[model samples]
Target: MERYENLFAQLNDRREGAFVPFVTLGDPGIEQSLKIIDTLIDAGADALELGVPFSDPLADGPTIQNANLRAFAAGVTPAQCFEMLALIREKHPTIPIGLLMYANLVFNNGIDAFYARCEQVGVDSVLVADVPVEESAPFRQAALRHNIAPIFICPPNADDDLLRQVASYGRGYTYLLSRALPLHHLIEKLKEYHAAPALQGFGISSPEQVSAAVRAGAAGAISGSAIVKIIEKNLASPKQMLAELRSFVSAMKAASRA
Candidate 1:
């Protein structure tokens, strides 16, 4: 919560919006995952948006779903996910880290246990993809008890009633799915409720789209498939892979600054 506020304040002072990237933790392997995350931050990612690998990642696009499979194939368990997170936290004490995952991961693990582990490892927020705001009472209560932000995603088809609920309940920042151009109006209304800062995600890949999202009132843009494509391409060329991501991430960050 403090990191998100501080990150926003700093970005605001600089007149720059955020450029976040999403990757599945342990995409190929645990060690490689850490290296990838380090490169992203080194290349100027404003924050980290990571996925916890799951068998059924229903809300994700094909690219991310495959990434999830790769993570599982590498023998990534939830135990190792927290270990990796703690390692990242030890190094990047101030960088905001949020997890986007399916509800079953939270449900099966028990919300209280899951979120407590999250807080213990320096997680800032959690978004259970299948959990609608209407049924979020228990999830929200558990997360708050652990001092973790219960992130609410506002879908493109959201009505004002839905927007009001997400705007009111969402903590840290809001997750705004991109099916937009109506977003300018939607974002304006969220602010009416004194809502959390909004970051537009889904289908965002290029620097141009990053700039456009911020222009339309998003505080940031989160790109997953585009970044994951880089990872998928260079499983053979680790050195070359990191370079490609560096440029892509840098270009996206530069657009946010522009």
Candidate 2:
């Protein structure tokens, strides 16, 4: 998408890495969810990885799983997320948005049905977390038809062939699952295949970690449970919640400026 292209180009010129944040949409509630996104953007989030609430999120940590329950308690439905996403598009038309989801959410609605909504709401990319790259062809085709990037996660254990397949199909950015390994090698391999710049995730939660990923050759890092933990902590006081979230996000985004 042009949003991603422009984002990468601008960040490259400034010699800064990208700081993408993740939050389950409507975690606390619809209105507050929108406010959270606005706060992150105003705090300098370069991109977003928003998740649709699901009953079984195999890849998520306890923080995000609890977040899904919170959203459900708040009466947030699958369709409502798109409404929220569309409102986001209406508000911040330029910030790149990617949906990190379970395949059940995508396939249950029919691939084209799901992606059409993505295109309609100006989403930049989609990552069905549970979908193996081998089964990504249909999803990729549908996503491309709608001009939405199909993101793939490259786990540390991925073999060379698997890595190449992920590199071939992904757009926007690659999600490099964090495990104790030589990420530098995988990052280079992705680059070698001309894949989207890799953004290491899973346990990245601090400025030090963010900068460390960049130093190791990743284009950036994505922090989820860390940021979501903030919302969980400050649920009672919206003002303090926003304040702390802002500072945390500010520090993280600043780390990318090296």
Candidate 3:
């Protein structure tokens, strides 16, 4: 098993849900982004989901879209993001880092080369938002070649057949919709299909929401816009940014325990 499997296993052993946080690479700048990441780790993040800034991010909401724009304005490139990943891996060897990005970035960088780069930087898994399971074979094969897990998202409205596909195709863990009506029922359905452990996300902001997700049978919950909003609010003050981020993460982590 890789870092992701091991981490989830540990969480399971402890009967605790994971507190995964998301951030856009170089949202303000590369150096500042690194600091923010370190602060999050120190604040007890179980795993990370990082966004690679792209010219057009169709899957992202306005908050993340703005973050990508900020990163682009600051001249953050894919190469720099990889460099940052390497540095973070060195500092914290065991943390699982998952990239949540678009298919174009992977295709533009060459699927083989992109997965290879992720391997080099110690990335544990990746989720290409725009690539559905129907077209995931090539990308998934490349990820497996490099020993990186290929993650997938289970849409809220997916049919049984599609859910089965996601269950069979996904590695690491699955990203689920937070708005899954009758959330526990949906979680049971995914489990019935033997899908990768579901980690609910989207509009998951407060500690209460994280707690609710755990109670709903999710393996964990991911907080993106809520956390990134903090960074957006404090871009002018690095100290305040780290302080607020640390506090927010600490609160969320505390809520992960049943």
For model 1, what is the error of residue 246's alpha carbon versus the real structure, in angstroms, after optimal superposition?
0.5
Q: Tens digit of lDDT per residue, candidate 1, span 1-258?
A: 599999999999989889889899998899999999999999998889988987665555688778888999999988999999999989999999988877888768688999899999999998887776779998888889998888998888778888889998888889888654388887888888888999988578899988888898889888967888899989899999999999999899888976
Clashing pairs in 1: none
Regions more than 4 Å wrong, model 2:
57-59
> lDDT scores for all predictions?
0.88, 0.89, 0.88
Expressed as tens digits, the lDDT of each residue in 15-105 for candidate 3 is 8999999999998899999999999999999999999986565556777888989999999999999999999999999999999888879
> Which candidate's lDDT is highest?
2
Clashes of 1: 0
Error (Å) of candidate 1 at residue 106 is 2.2
> For residues 35-151, could you state the per-residue lDDT of candidate 2 as single tens digits?
999999999889999999976757557888899999999999889999999999889989999998887887687999999999999899998877766677999999999999999
Summed over model 3, clashes come to 0
Would you estimate the TM-scores of all the predictions?
A: 0.96, 0.96, 0.95
Model 3 worst lDDT window (10 residues): 54-63
Q: What is the lDDT of residue 215 in candidate 1?
A: 91
**Candidate 2 lDDT score relative to the true structure:** 0.89
Off by over 4 Å in 3: 57-59
Candidate 1 has an lDDT of: 0.88
